[PDB]
Motif scaffolding. Structure first.
Motif, PDB file in Angstrom:
ATOM      1  N   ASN A   1       0.801  -1.210   0.000  1.00 36.75           N
ATOM      2  CA  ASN A   1       0.000   0.000   0.000  1.00 36.75           C
ATOM      3  C   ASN A   1       0.835   1.260   0.000  1.00 36.75           C
TER       4      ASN A   1
ATOM      5  N   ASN B   1      -0.408   4.240  -1.946  1.00 36.86           N
ATOM      6  CA  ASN B   1      -1.843   4.033  -2.016  1.00 36.86           C
ATOM      7  C   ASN B   1      -2.636   5.013  -1.163  1.00 36.86           C
ATOM      8  N   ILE B   2      -2.222   5.237   0.078  1.00 32.78           N
ATOM      9  CA  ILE B   2      -3.171   5.556   1.138  1.00 32.78           C
ATOM     10  C   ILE B   2      -3.595   7.016   1.199  1.00 32.78           C
TER      11      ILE B   2
ATOM     12  N   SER C   1      -2.099   7.497   7.442  1.00 31.31           N
ATOM     13  CA  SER C   1      -1.188   6.406   7.127  1.00 31.31           C
ATOM     14  C   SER C   1      -0.651   5.749   8.387  1.00 31.31           C
TER      15      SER C   1
ATOM     16  N   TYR D   1      -2.923   3.263   9.452  1.00 31.98           N
ATOM     17  CA  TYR D   1      -3.255   2.109   8.629  1.00 31.98           C
ATOM     18  C   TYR D   1      -2.136   1.087   8.599  1.00 31.98           C
TER      19      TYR D   1
ATOM     20  N   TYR E   1     -11.213   2.345   4.985  1.00 36.50           N
ATOM     21  CA  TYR E   1     -10.510   1.836   3.805  1.00 36.50           C
ATOM     22  C   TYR E   1     -11.288   0.777   3.061  1.00 36.50           C
TER      23      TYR E   1
ATOM     24  N   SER F   1     -13.943  -0.377   0.149  1.00 39.91           N
ATOM     25  CA  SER F   1     -14.221   0.096  -1.198  1.00 39.91           C
ATOM     26  C   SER F   1     -15.494   0.922  -1.242  1.00 39.91           C
TER      27      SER F   1
ATOM     28  N   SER G   1     -18.835  -0.983   2.698  1.00 43.58           N
ATOM     29  CA  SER G   1     -17.926  -1.712   3.554  1.00 43.58           C
ATOM     30  C   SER G   1     -18.509  -1.970   4.924  1.00 43.58           C
TER      31      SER G   1
ATOM     32  N   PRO H   1      -9.695  -3.488   1.733  1.00 46.43           N
ATOM     33  CA  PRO H   1      -8.512  -2.891   1.126  1.00 46.43           C
ATOM     34  C   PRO H   1      -7.489  -3.961   0.821  1.00 46.43           C
TER      35      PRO H   1
ATOM     36  N   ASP I   1      -6.217   0.592  -8.217  1.00 49.40           N
ATOM     37  CA  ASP I   1      -5.629   1.918  -8.121  1.00 49.40           C
ATOM     38  C   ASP I   1      -5.715   2.672  -9.433  1.00 49.40           C
TER      39      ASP I   1
END
Lengths: 124, 64, 486, 174, 90, 83, 54
Positions: free
Chosen positions: C103, C106-107, C111, C114, C155, C157, C160, C239, C352
């Protein structure tokens, strides 16, 4: 609408428009759609159970009816296998003896024992 | 070991000040002197509690 | 004094990296990477000659609450390994930085939350394989679930909420029914232990119902038929790293549990009750793999693919044979390789780039990313169970062992080689062929890091595929250790 | 001794305070502003950190450094998403590549090595040599043969004899 | 180094100490591998019989071939549990 | 055909029409690897090869059958065809 | 005229990575099979120090 499961999928939907499905392969290719790879214009309402009417769906041959063509295939089966079984009654026998073997049919040569001679021995 | 128990209890107190700052919306190290106080008090419980447990075990040993 | 001062120094180093760097994303990797070298040096001094559990230590004893204990009385939490326990750790530690890598770009939102969560659930499932008691194996069997629930809900989609609910709901359902049998054997024996129990027997009617607890625990966790409710719709909103760590670790963790918990003291009930397993096992192969073919979401196909291997794996587990056990382990490690790379295919790279996981958008991907299309195809071919990848090497041994224990159930089990291939190639050719879709702008190719994860995982399949005997020097005890054919 | 600059880092935020936002900084599709900013982006690359130096200092320095490096990260990558920026050379390696090519991959290769060579300690090799030992233990006369015969003579004994002793463990049966 | 630890039965070892129990488990394990090596070695020899013989392997090594097929059900991993969890003559 | 192709993407196969300029040069390397591969492998595989027929004596295999008989008589085994 | 595309260097960085690692591993393997009679055991077995079973 079209098939059995299609009419057996109608009472599930509540807000889908229930369009008529039709195989996109069986649309003509000479109309000029958006997706020329899939014969598909962009904002086309897709079918409930799309993937049996995709181009990526199986081929769905169009000349013979399915139920009709099944009869032709089993007819080819019958005309082969039945007549072949009839020829078993019409076969002539052969002209020579099957050939014999020394050493009492080579039972000793395929391993074997005098006690195990019954599972060996070829035309002694 | 007594000292190893004390280190863990004072670590619990360190976590108490660490959590309390994060509800107070302070940084991690905001009032450092408080980490000493929490560092003693919870450790003090580990003082007491282990002193309980010492005094527990011998009683069993006196019943044999 | 020294071992205390190590942590006393390292937390200060951690605080100063918190201070100067914003993200600890570098130092999270730095810790998780050194976890390899730690466990690998533990692998060096491993005694292969001992069924005896080597690296043993107790935590939370009376005489030492905080740390190590050497006593003649111990009610704490035992820890130790062998072989079987070891490889899955070795499955873990070469996986867990990768998803932590997974990731990186990604985030862009919380962060330090996560990645701490992603590392933390993996640190939990590390010590899941170190555990030795039914309490101790249980108590981190769901320490996953807090930081799994938070990691799914944030996180996620889209929708969720339902996903995070189901990963609580059904896991907790099977969790309690695990605990039922745990409580029963912890008051019959009064020893939660993975050591003593081989000495112990049970009455047959008791051994029946405690199996009835543990089996529909693992029926949840390795999804057999009244479960895999949740399996589609927990992947499909997860995620990236969470879906990867689920399908690589949690399934094989329950696969480890049925090796570890059930089989060695369920010897006398499971010989009655393996056909009850095999009905459901063949069923959850065939039904799930047939249900793959009509799936519109992209990630969900890889999810049902993750079912269809574990269905093969557990019949080799309960095959009561040698080849079944070894095949079950090599299936576990091979699927834990090949599957998170497939989640890199759907959620890793592609989600992504386009944020939509519907299959029908994606065709003609070869024409603008050929060096993606290579990693598409050969990874899919590994998911079928070609040889030289370990997947068939697991499939053949486990189908053989299931053929031993009952031949007809194995003869219908063998068609899973076909049924695994149908959806995989139905997905692969639609992704590969045709004109590049009109919906699709040209995006960036596979990056260096996304080549890199694939480069590790595919080679890790191929090592076992060329030689499955690379890890045989551990398991050969446990290949024996779980047979009751007298 | 990587000791970083103090007063330059004081002065860096003075430049930063006048700068336009990163959501503006490259929306102009020349070098009246571009020539300064894509050399400001080198201050993200310039690498003054202090290995030991970060330990010995205060939270204000760390926070000031953090805000600096945040805005430098911004202006480094934004014009990279437009266009130093007006260059095309792949020589900047990456962030993660230090501790993965120099830790992760060589440790993984070491892991592969140890898994190969530990298989030399096999139960199969060792059971083979133990079975070779037992034939010598009952029949040491086959030592008297030279090297080539001894293997086949062991094979003659293995096919002939039983040499397992497993029934000795099952004395409860009879 | 090729060490040789001893063989310990499961009869009369007092199933309370882990020492003798684990030794007996490992002994019945390693000895079963010794039993397996007979099958592996006779297979290694039987294929060489087939290599040299050509056609007359039927009568050259019939006893070696049925030796292999007789050893097959009695040479495998069988678990220490089955002898451990039960007792014959009882 | 020679339709225009986007030269940006780099494929492992080269892409559409990979005709790089120093192909006379780089082919000196890879073939130099290739030959240098093959003879290096063929020696290494050499002690692992063997002649199939005639590796041992018939006397050895006949004595192995003798050992088979000595084993099988001790187990008291009927023939495959005895009932 | 086969319409030549621009030149490319041979030793691309991954070609160095793959070839160097793999052939170094093979040379390392035969470096250890050198120690059949030179040392009687492998070089890495010295680095192994497991506890004895007892």
């Amino acid at each position: 609408i079209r098939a059995s499961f299609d009419k057996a999928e109608e009472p599930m939907l509540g807000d889908y428009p229930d369009i008529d499905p039709f195989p996109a392969q069986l649309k003509n290719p000479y109309k000029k759609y958006d997706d020329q790879q899939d014969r598909r214009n962009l904002e086309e309402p897709l079918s409930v159970n799309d993937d049996l009417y995709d181009m990526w769906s199986p081929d769905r041959f169009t000349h013979f009816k399915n139920q009709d063509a099944l009869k032709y295939f089993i007819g080819f089966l019958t005309i082969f296998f039945g007549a072949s079984y009839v020829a078993t009654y019409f076969v002539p026998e052969k002209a020579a003896i099957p050939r014999e073997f020394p050493y009492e049919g080579l039972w000793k040569e395929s391993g074997g024992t005098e006690k195990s001679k019954a599972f060996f021995g070829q035309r002694s | 070991a007594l000292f190893t128990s004390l280190v863990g209890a004072s670590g619990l107190g360190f976590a108490t000040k660490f959590l309390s700052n994060k509800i107070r919306l302070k940084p991690a190290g905001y009032y450092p002197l408080g980490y000493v106080f929490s560092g003693v008090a919870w450790a003090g419980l580990g003082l007491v509690l282990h002193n309980v447990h010492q005094h527990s075990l011998e009683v069993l040993e006196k019943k044999k | 004094m020294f071992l205390t001062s190590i942590l006393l120094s390292s937390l200060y180093l951690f605080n100063r990296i918190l201070a100067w760097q914003g993200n600890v994303k570098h130092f999270y990797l730095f810790a998780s990477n050194l976890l390899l070298l730690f466990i690998v040096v533990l692998y060096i001094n491993f005694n292969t000659f001992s069924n005896s559990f080597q690296f043993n230590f107790e935590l939370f004893n009376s005489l030492n609450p905080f740390g190590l204990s050497n006593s003649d009385i111990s009610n704490g939490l035992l820890f130790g390994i062998d072989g079987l326990s070891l490889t899955f750790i070795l499955l873990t530690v070469l996986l867990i930085p990768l998803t932590l890598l997974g990731n990186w770009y990604n985030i862009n939102f919380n962060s330090n939350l996560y990645y701490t969560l992603v590392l933390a659930i993996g640190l939990v499932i590390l010590l899941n394989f170190w555990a030795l008691d039914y309490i101790s194996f249980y108590i981190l069997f769901e320490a996953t679930l807090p930081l799994l629930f938070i990691l799914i809900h944030i996180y996620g989609s889209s929708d969720s909420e339902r996903a995070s609910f189901y990963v609580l709901m059904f896991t907790l359902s099977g969790s309690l029914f695990m605990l039922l049998s745990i409580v029963v054997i912890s008051i019959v024996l009064n020893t939660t232990n993975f050591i003593n129990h081989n000495l112990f027997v049970l009455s047959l009617d008791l051994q029946t119902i405690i199996w009835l607890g543990l089996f529909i625990a693992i029926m949840v966790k390795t999804p057999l038929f009244p479960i895999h409710v949740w399996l589609p719709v927990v992947h499909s909103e997860s995620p990236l790293a969470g879906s990867m760590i689920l399908a690589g670790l949690i399934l094989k963790l329950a696969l480890y549990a049925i090796l570890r918990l059930l089989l060695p003291l369920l010897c006398e009930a499971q010989i009655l009750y393996t056909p009850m397993i095999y009905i459901i096992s063949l069923l959850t192969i065939i039904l799930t793999s047939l249900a793959t073919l009509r799936q519109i979401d992209l990630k969900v196909i890889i999810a049902y693919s993750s079912i269809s291997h574990m269905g093969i794996a557990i019949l080799g587990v309960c095959s009561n044979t040698s080849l079944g056990i070894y095949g079950s382990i090599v299936l576990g490690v091979a699927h834990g390789f090949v599957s998170p790379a497939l989640f890199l295919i759907v959620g890793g790279i592609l989600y992504d780039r386009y944020h939509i996981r519907i299959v029908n958008y994606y065709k003609g991907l070869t024409t603008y990313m050929p060096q993606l299309a290579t990693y598409i195809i050969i990874l899919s071919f590994a998911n079928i169970g070609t040889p030289l990848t370990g997947n068939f090497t697991g499939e053949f041994l486990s189908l053989q062992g299931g053929f031993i224990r009952n031949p007809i159930i194995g003869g219908i089990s063998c068609i899973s080689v076909l049924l695994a291939a149908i959806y995989q190639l139905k997905l692969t050719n639609k992704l590969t062929g045709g004109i590049s879709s009109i919906y699709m702008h040209r995006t960036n190719d596979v990056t260096i890091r996304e080549k890199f994860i694939m480069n590790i995982l595919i080679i890790s399949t191929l090592i076992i595929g060329i030689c499955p005997q690379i890890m045989y020097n551990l398991l050969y005890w446990t290949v024996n250790n779980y047979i009751y054919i007298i | 001794l990587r000791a970083y600059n103090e007063e330059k880092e004081l002065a860096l935020k003075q430049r930063l305070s006048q700068l336009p936002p990163p959501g503006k900084a490259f929306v102009t599709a020349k070098e009246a502003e571009l020539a300064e900013l894509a050399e400001i982006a080198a201050l993200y690359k310039t690498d003054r950190v202090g290995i030991l130096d970060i330990l010995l200092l205060g939270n204000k320095h760390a926070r000031l450094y953090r805000d600096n490096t945040a805005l430098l990260k911004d202006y480094y990558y934004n014009g990279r998403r437009i266009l130093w920026e007006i260059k095309r050379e792949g020589a900047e390696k990456e962030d993660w590549v230090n501790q993965m090519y120099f830790l992760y991959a060589p440790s993984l290769i070491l892991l592969l090595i140890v898994m190969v060579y530990k298989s030399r300690e096999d139960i199969t090799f060792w059971a083979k040599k133990e079975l070779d030992q037992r034939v010598l233990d009952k029949h040491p006369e086959i030592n008297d043969a030279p090297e080539n015969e001894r293997d086949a003579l062991i094979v003659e004994r293995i096919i002939a004899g039983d040499y397992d002793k497993l029934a000795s463990l099952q004395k409860k049966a009879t | 180094e090729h060490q040789r630890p001893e063989l310990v039965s499961f009869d009369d070892i007092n199933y309370n100490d882990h020492k003798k129990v684990r030794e007996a488990q490992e002994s019945y394990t390693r000895e079963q591998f010794i039993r397996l090596e007979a099958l592996k070695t006779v297979r290694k020899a039987l294929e060489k019989c087939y290599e040299e013989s050509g056609p007359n392997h039927f009568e050259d090594c019939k006893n070696l071939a049925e030796q292999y097929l007789d050893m097959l059900p009695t040479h495998r991993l069988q678990g220490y549990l089955g002898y451990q969890r039960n007792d014959p003559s009882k | 055909g020679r339709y225009p192709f986007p030269k940006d993407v780099i494929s492992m196969t080269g892409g559409w029409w990979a005709n790089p300029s120093n192909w006379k040069l780089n082919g000196l390397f890879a073939t130099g690897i290739a030959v240098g591969l093959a003879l290096w492998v063929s020696t290494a595989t050499l002690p692992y090869t063997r002649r199939r027929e005639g590796i041992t004596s018939e006397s050895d295999i006949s004595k192995w059958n003798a050992a088979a008989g000595v084993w099988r008589e001790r187990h008291g085994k009927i023939s495959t065809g005895e009932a | 005229g086969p319409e030549l595309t621009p030149a490319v260097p041979f030793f691309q960085p991954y070609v160095l990575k793959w070839a160097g690692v793999s052939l170094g591993l093979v040379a390392f393997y035969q470096f250890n099979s050198s120690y059949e009679a030179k040392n009687g055991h492998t070089w890495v077995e010295t680095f192994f120090h497991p506890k004895s079973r007892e």
